[PDB]
Design a protein around this ligand. Sequence first.
Ligand SMILES: [Mg+2]
Length: 428
Amino acid sequence: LASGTPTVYYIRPVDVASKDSLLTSASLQSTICLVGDNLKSIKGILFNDQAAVLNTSYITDHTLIVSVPNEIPSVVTDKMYMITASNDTIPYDFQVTISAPSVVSMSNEWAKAGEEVTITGDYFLDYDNYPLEIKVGKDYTLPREAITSIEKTKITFTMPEDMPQHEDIVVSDKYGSTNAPFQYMDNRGMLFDFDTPNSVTNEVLGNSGWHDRIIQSDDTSLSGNYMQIGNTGVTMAANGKWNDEFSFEYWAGNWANPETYASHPRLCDVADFSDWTNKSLKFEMLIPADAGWGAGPMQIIFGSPSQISLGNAGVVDVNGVTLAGCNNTWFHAQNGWGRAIYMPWYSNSSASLYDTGDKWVTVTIPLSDFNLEFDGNSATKSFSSINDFSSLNIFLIKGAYNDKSVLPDGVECTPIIKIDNIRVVPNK
Ligand SMILES: [Mg+2]
């Protein structure tokens, strides 16, 4: 309608109670107001390469109100292009604020040199004028040649031989830097690597209960010894029936009276479980392709010395706790006790054989998700103290309280689950 070249003196927000009186940037879908003259000479507006929608009814010759498009720009120039009726382009420098990268998981936090590693998250956006980078520590930057592909949710790279271990990992791009919730060869909050003696009793923790599991190392090892649940040809029923062949048990204590925990210490003394709601249980896991896991949910149960211990019942420890002794009722006592139940073989109301292609993958289970009970219903008693992380059970079983079960059946299988590097780590 109007004539002349549009100008913009400044950009202000559109709502009344705004903190800002002027904007040099704006998020997606943000409604902004241009303050210039001859603004009705504007026929189109593009933010970067994204065209905006102009409502003629709210465009005076001194104010134009437009909302930033929702789509992420593919080529970012930090300019808003105003197009006149004659298709002339008038650029006004203006940045479209995009969320910083979010880092959630790494495929194998213990990946060896040469292995294909994928980092899963969101807002991994790579541009020519501003490349995304992975920085480990303070002096190392991941070479771009190691990176094979970058998608919005996944970054894929080939692990160099010399990436710094046990250091912070930062994913940075044009829109900011964010620390990864993991480290390379992460050993923080280390509980069972089955190789290194623990810091308190100078013992390499392993079996400490009734049903001892395989702990060995061979050509399939990720790092030294691993712990194995199941074996070749050992059948797991589709209904997840009780079978101690799929139970790993570490019970604190070693038949001492009084129980000093001089042997088999409490897990809460081996690693720090304070502020557990902001922490997660992590471990690396291998399931052979020929030994898929398709039935029997994995119940990971932490317990206090009041519930379970390696010894006789009635013994008191150096903490005044009356030990429960050896038992297998504490994790199914119908008392609302919370435990995590991991079941990747159950995907969208249907059960299938889950394996991991004979590779080691890192599994993250936040301690806040230990809120189920043996039957699968929501747990009524949460964690109350760090003392509740003294013993650990890993049991592949579908529980059924009072002949009723909420967890689902699977398919009959012969699963082999190799586990190493059981640790507890901060969520961030
Ligand atoms: Mg190991």
